[PDB]
Design a protein around this ligand. Structure first.
Ligand SMILES: CCCCCCCCCCCCCC(=O)NO
Ligand SMILES: [Cl-]
Ligand SMILES: [Cl-]
Length: 210
């Protein structure tokens, strides 16, 4: 599980969905997240995979707190398991929870060669649920940048070529209290392609400075 002192990620899910007919929908998951301790990774080995001026990962980690910084490696499933109808939905669903009511800002920077090409910013409002606070982003539609990228990768003949492109592709998710701008949760994403028919896999690491 991925949790700072202040906020916990419960679910993250990137997917495409197709309407075979008005009453029938196929949904394919690219990546999914749904309590062990975590192996550590030096944060200084990923500075080069994210923007590094002001608002950069180095200055974020230095601002603290350190209990907030994770790395997820995703084995993304890019199999055509659902028949490719044109005009399909490409979406991202995620849930967070906290003990305290707060208004959170969720920054999702898509990076190529350690440079921002897309930032998505969504403000989410606490909902009281079973004595805790929950934040739902439900079927947040993907940008054209990401849907094209997913098209480019699937039209490659060999998985090793996909993994070659993916080496230079990273996403940084930063969750802040809208008001205080206090860092609640930071998750660096790195990607390879899935080969096993077990499907999409993921590994979680703690980011440390040493
Ligand atoms: C890399 C191929 C598998 C797709 C993984 C995508 C995971 C997260 C979806 C992209 C987040 C950016 C949100 C967006 O599309 N626009 O802001
Ligand atoms: Cl997102
Ligand atoms: Cl309730």
């Amino acid at each position: 599980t991925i949790a700072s002192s202040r906020l916990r990620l419960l679910e993250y899910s990137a997917f495409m969905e197709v309407q075979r007919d008005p009453d029938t929908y196929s949904k394919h998951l690219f990546v999914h997240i749904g309590d062990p301790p975590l192996e550590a990774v030096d944060v200084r080995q990923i500075y080069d995979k994210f923007p590094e001026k002001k608002g950069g990962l180095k200055e974020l980690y230095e601002k603290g707190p350190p209990n907030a910084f994770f790395l997820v490696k995703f084995w993304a499933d890019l199999n055509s398991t659902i028949q490719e109808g044109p005009g399909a939905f490409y979406g991202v669903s995620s849930q967070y929870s906290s003990a305290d009511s707060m208004t959170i800002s969720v920054s999702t920077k898509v990076c190529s060669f350690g440079k921002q090409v897309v930032e998505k910013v969504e403000t989410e409002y606490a909902r009281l649920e079973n004595g805790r606070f929950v934040y739902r982003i439900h079927r947040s539609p993907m940008c054209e940048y990401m849907i094209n990228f997913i098209h480019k990768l699937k039209h490659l003949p060999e998985k090793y070529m996909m993994n070659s492109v993916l080496e230079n592709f990273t996403i940084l998710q930063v969750v802040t209290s809208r008001d205080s701008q206090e860092t609640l949760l930071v998750i660096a994403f790195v990607f390879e392609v899935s080969t096993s028919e077990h499907g999409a896999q993921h590994h979680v690491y703690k980011l440390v400075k040493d």
